[PDB]
Enzyme design. Structure first.
Site, PDB file in Angstrom:
ATOM      1  N   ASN A 173      -7.447  -2.966  -3.646  1.00 20.00           N
ATOM      2  CA  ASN A 173      -8.764  -2.926  -3.461  1.00 20.00           C
ATOM      3  C   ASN A 173      -9.551  -1.533  -3.592  1.00 20.00           C
ATOM      4  O   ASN A 173     -10.516  -1.326  -3.529  1.00 20.00           O
ATOM      5  CB  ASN A 173      -9.421  -3.686  -2.199  1.00 20.00           C
ATOM      6  N   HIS A 174      -8.414  -0.500  -3.496  1.00 21.83           N
ATOM      7  CA  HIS A 174      -8.761   1.106  -3.615  1.00 21.83           C
ATOM      8  C   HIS A 174      -8.705   1.360  -4.907  1.00 21.83           C
ATOM      9  O   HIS A 174      -9.029   2.488  -5.352  1.00 21.83           O
ATOM     10  CB  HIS A 174      -7.934   1.547  -2.577  1.00 21.83           C
ATOM     11  N   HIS A 188      -2.730  -8.206  -3.637  1.00 20.15           N
ATOM     12  CA  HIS A 188      -2.865  -7.383  -2.670  1.00 20.15           C
ATOM     13  C   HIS A 188      -3.545  -8.009  -1.292  1.00 20.15           C
ATOM     14  O   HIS A 188      -3.246  -7.512  -0.301  1.00 20.15           O
ATOM     15  CB  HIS A 188      -3.966  -6.401  -3.158  1.00 20.15           C
ATOM     16  N   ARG A 231     -14.007  -6.917   7.286  1.00 16.45           N
ATOM     17  CA  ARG A 231     -13.925  -6.116   6.597  1.00 16.45           C
ATOM     18  C   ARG A 231     -15.311  -5.874   5.659  1.00 16.45           C
ATOM     19  O   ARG A 231     -15.777  -4.846   5.278  1.00 16.45           O
ATOM     20  CB  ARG A 231     -12.952  -6.273   5.393  1.00 16.45           C
ATOM     21  N   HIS A 278      -1.249   4.358  -1.007  1.00 10.88           N
ATOM     22  CA  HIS A 278      -2.174   5.278  -0.862  1.00 10.88           C
ATOM     23  C   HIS A 278      -1.755   6.802  -0.705  1.00 10.88           C
ATOM     24  O   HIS A 278      -1.800   7.561   0.084  1.00 10.88           O
ATOM     25  CB  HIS A 278      -2.607   5.025   0.516  1.00 10.88           C
ATOM     26  N   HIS A 281      -2.303  -4.698   1.908  1.00  8.48           N
ATOM     27  CA  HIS A 281      -3.628  -4.599   2.343  1.00  8.48           C
ATOM     28  C   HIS A 281      -4.035  -4.445   3.710  1.00  8.48           C
ATOM     29  O   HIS A 281      -5.054  -3.618   4.126  1.00  8.48           O
ATOM     30  CB  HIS A 281      -4.522  -5.959   1.870  1.00  8.48           C
ATOM     31  N   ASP A 340      -6.070   7.150  -2.399  1.00  9.35           N
ATOM     32  CA  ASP A 340      -7.012   7.334  -1.440  1.00  9.35           C
ATOM     33  C   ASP A 340      -6.111   7.680  -0.121  1.00  9.35           C
ATOM     34  O   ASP A 340      -5.076   7.186  -0.089  1.00  9.35           O
ATOM     35  CB  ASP A 340      -7.940   6.438  -1.078  1.00  9.35           C
ATOM     36  N   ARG A 341      -6.771   8.570   0.854  1.00  9.88           N
ATOM     37  CA  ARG A 341      -6.215   8.802   2.219  1.00  9.88           C
ATOM     38  C   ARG A 341      -5.108   9.704   2.156  1.00  9.88           C
ATOM     39  O   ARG A 341      -4.962  10.611   2.948  1.00  9.88           O
ATOM     40  CB  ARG A 341      -5.848   7.281   2.975  1.00  9.88           C
ATOM     41  N   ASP A 373      -3.259  -0.648  -4.111  1.00  9.97           N
ATOM     42  CA  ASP A 373      -3.752   0.570  -3.165  1.00  9.97           C
ATOM     43  C   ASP A 373      -2.557   1.776  -3.315  1.00  9.97           C
ATOM     44  O   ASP A 373      -2.021   2.216  -2.456  1.00  9.97           O
ATOM     45  CB  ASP A 373      -3.535   0.078  -1.978  1.00  9.97           C
ATOM     46  N   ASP A 432       0.792  -1.272  -0.038  1.00  5.45           N
ATOM     47  CA  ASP A 432      -0.035   0.258   0.116  1.00  5.45           C
ATOM     48  C   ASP A 432       0.770   1.165  -0.060  1.00  5.45           C
ATOM     49  O   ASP A 432       1.558   1.400   0.915  1.00  5.45           O
ATOM     50  CB  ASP A 432      -0.930  -0.056   1.171  1.00  5.45           C
TER      51      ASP A 432
HETATM   52 MN   LIG Z   1      -6.200  -2.902   0.452  1.00  7.71          MN
HETATM   53 MN   LIG Z   2      -4.998  -0.079   1.715  1.00 10.42          MN
END
Ligand SMILES: [Mn+2]
Ligand SMILES: [Mn+2]
Ligand SMILES: *CCN(CC[C@H](N)C(=O)O)C[C@H]1O[C@@H](n2cnc3c(N)ncnc32)[C@H](O)[C@@H]1O
Lengths: 303, 315
Positions: A116-117, A166, A213, A58, A240, A87-88, A84, A56
């Site tokens: 997944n993002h 991931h 999740r 991000h 992840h 985001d964030r 990933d 990740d």
């Molecule tokens: Mn993830």
């Molecule tokens: Mn993540």
């Protein structure tokens, strides 16, 4: 021709390195060339060692720059990213543009997998949509990247022995040939094989289990050991999950988690790590903290 | 001085966050829209859930105080910001004898403009006022049931004078509210304030919401992050633990004290409420909420609350 295009892409990479975003049309072109490349790639990307493996990121651009200083720059260091990218963090545009730009420039030296993002619905909530809509004046760029995520390979295999993805494993998958059989060119589904790969987590619980999740599954050591022995694997590598020390072995070293966003959300205080694999698949880890970026603005708390 | 602009800036932050959660349906507030813009960029699910529990938390303690005093009381919101509680209490028919709000003059000026400009805000105050006109001379709005005072909380002589100018009665039971405020002044200054509050009323209650367990890496990163926003947390030394938070209240003139960390409060929420919220937004990483919520607390202290039974109040 593509002779001119390669020269321009160098300049784009030069530009993104100083955290300056590309123009709207520039992004449109880059995504199309990336699409034409990713289409010709397997759901299971076969990779050669030496390679450095990352989790990740991000949208934490400056810390991706920190990653490169430590692992070495592309294409000198062969790289494999486990999703990933967005985001964030506050620089998803610059982060994901650069990683795509490096793929187009050095296809054999960069592997980028779907996280997944890398999904339409998730980016609408966790910052990426909002960032594009601010940095550009419309959703076109968000549109261009999200359209591209559909083409990102789900999985990678390092020298027939190390399996990279991931999230985690799926009850809907026993073999790698079950992975290459999937149709990945779609938005990440709510359920089913493709979903679980991007969402699942390992745990201490025996067998399978309901995921906290609310997507994918929780798998125990007994699932890892079946999947490794049934596929001739020594290690399942993944991202992840936030890990405080940057990486974490579990399931008697059958699984390892790599997390490459230091001080996640600009709050968490975790170390980030990357996993180097040498010429003979011997591993080592490089822990690192965030780069000293004075102008980075505050994350949310309760004020 | 140097830190005051930055501290004042935090009111804009909380207001923006509170309105956003409201807009997507965490709780009902038809009044905040008159005080702050609708943020076009989302706040992350853990921020909205976090602000919810905070609001719910304080809301339940306010209701309990009012219940126990039968609304025959005073409420003094300290560092009130863009607080809408007056109007919301008037809708719920749970209005106290008088509602007092306190903040920096700069903040009050922002709030007096909104009130004067917008009838949805001013009519309810006038419906209950003795005059047809609201008078706002200086940095003070005074009315029969509602007052908004511009004062520095670190200067207690200014504070006491102006509350009494607005005819605050010492002999009425009084709830005081510090919702994320005490942490912006020195430990000694927030002690003085708590001490004064305890000395002024024979029958009183205090709600304190702020940071807790700050003696770790997470808390340290927060301190550094808020300093980028020119905002130093002058009273973090008091945010050591739930035990020090209860001890801060008892040492400074209060008879009982309770404190829970925000996560403990979150897990003690009614299951029907949890279910409603958790179906509003999807949060895949509960460990992020967990880490954030363990670093905040809701505390409440009482004194002289025998006859009324204020010892029995819970969120
Ligand atoms: Mn993830
Ligand atoms: Mn993540
Ligand atoms: C954290 C932002 N606000 C919270 C306002 C409100 N309680 C809420 O929305 O939850 C903090 C407010 O506190 C005020 N403040 C800090 N320090 C002082 C002093 N010394 N005197 C008067 N007011 C103070 C801030 O101005 C802010 O509005």
């Amino acid at each position: 021709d593509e002779k001119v295009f390669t020269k321009e892409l160098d300049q784009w990479i030069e530009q993104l390195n100083e955290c300056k975003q590309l123009s709207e049309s520039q992004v449109k072109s880059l995504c199309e060339k990336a699409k034409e490349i990713l289409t010709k790639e397997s759901n299971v990307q076969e990779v050669r060692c030496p390679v450095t493996v990352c989790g990740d990121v991000h949208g934490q651009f400056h810390d991706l720059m920190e990653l490169f200083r430590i692992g070495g720059k592309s294409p000198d260091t062969n790289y494999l990213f486990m999703g990933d990218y967005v985001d964030r963090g506050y620089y998803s545009v610059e982060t994901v543009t650069l990683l795509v730009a490096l793929k187009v420039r050095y296809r054999e030296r960069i592997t980028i997998l779907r996280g997944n993002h890398e999904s339409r619905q998730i980016t609408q909530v966790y910052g990426f949509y909002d960032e594009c809509l601010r940095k550009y004046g419309n959703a076109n760029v968000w549109k261009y990247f999200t359209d591209l995520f559909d083409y990102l390979p789900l999985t990678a295999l390092v020298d027939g022995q190390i399996f990279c993805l991931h999230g985690g494993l799926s009850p809907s998958i026993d073999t790698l040939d079950h992975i290459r059989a999937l149709d990945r060119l779609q938005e990440v589904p709510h359920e089913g094989p493709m979903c679980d790969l991007l969402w699942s987590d390992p745990d201490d619980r025996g067998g399978w289990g309901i995921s906290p999740r609310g997507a994918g599954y929780t798998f125990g050591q007994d699932i890892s050991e079946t999947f490794n022995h049934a596929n001739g694997l020594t290690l399942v590598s993944r991202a992840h999950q936030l890990v405080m020390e940057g990486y974490n072995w579990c399931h008697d070293r059958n699984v390892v988690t790599i997390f490459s966003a230091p001080n996640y959300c600009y709050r968490c205080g975790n170390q980030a790590a990357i996993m180097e694999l040498d010429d003979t698949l011997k591993y080592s880890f490089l822990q690192f903290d965030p780069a000293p970026h004075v102008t980075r603005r505050t994350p949310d708390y309760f004020l | 001085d140097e830190n005051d602009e930055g501290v004042r800036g935090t009111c804009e932050d909380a207001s923006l966050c509170k309105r956003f959660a409201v807009s997507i349906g965490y709780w009902h507030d038809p009044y905040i829209q008159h005080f702050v813009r609708l943020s076009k960029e989302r706040k992350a699910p853990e921020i909205n859930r976090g602000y919810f529990a905070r609001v719910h938390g304080v809301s339940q303690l306010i209701k309990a105080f009012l219940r126990k005093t039968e609304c025959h009381c005073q409420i003094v919101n300290l560092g009130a910001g863009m607080d809408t509680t007056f109007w919301r209490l008037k809708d719920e028919d749970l209005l106290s004898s008088k509602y007092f709000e306190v903040d920096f003059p700069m903040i009050v000026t922002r709030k007096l403009h909104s009130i004067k400009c917008k009838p949805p805000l001013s009519s309810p105050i006038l419906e209950l006022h003795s005059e047809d006109t609201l008078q706002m001379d200086g940095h003070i709005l005074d009315s029969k049931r509602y007052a908004v005072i511009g004062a520095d909380l670190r200067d207690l002589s200014e504070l006491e004078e102006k509350l009494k100018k607005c005819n605050m009665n010492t002999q009425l039971p009084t709830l005081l509210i510090a919702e994320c405020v005490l942490v912006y002044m020195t430990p000694e200054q927030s002690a003085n304030l708590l001490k004064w509050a305890a000395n002024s009323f024979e029958r009183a209650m205090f709600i304190n919401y702020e940071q807790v367990n700050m003696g770790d890496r997470f808390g340290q990163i927060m301190i550094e992050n808020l300093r980028r926003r020119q905002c130093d947390l002058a009273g973090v030394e008091t945010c050591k633990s739930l035990e020090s938070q209860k001890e801060r209240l008892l040492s400074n003139g209060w008879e009982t004290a309770s404190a829970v960390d925000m996560m403990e409060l979150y897990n003690r929420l009614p299951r029907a409420e949890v279910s409603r919220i958790e179906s509003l937004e999807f949060l895949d990483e509960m460990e992020l909420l967990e880490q954030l919520m363990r670093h905040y607390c809701l505390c409440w202290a009482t004194k002289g609350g025998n006859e009324l039974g204020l010892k029995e109040i819970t969120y």
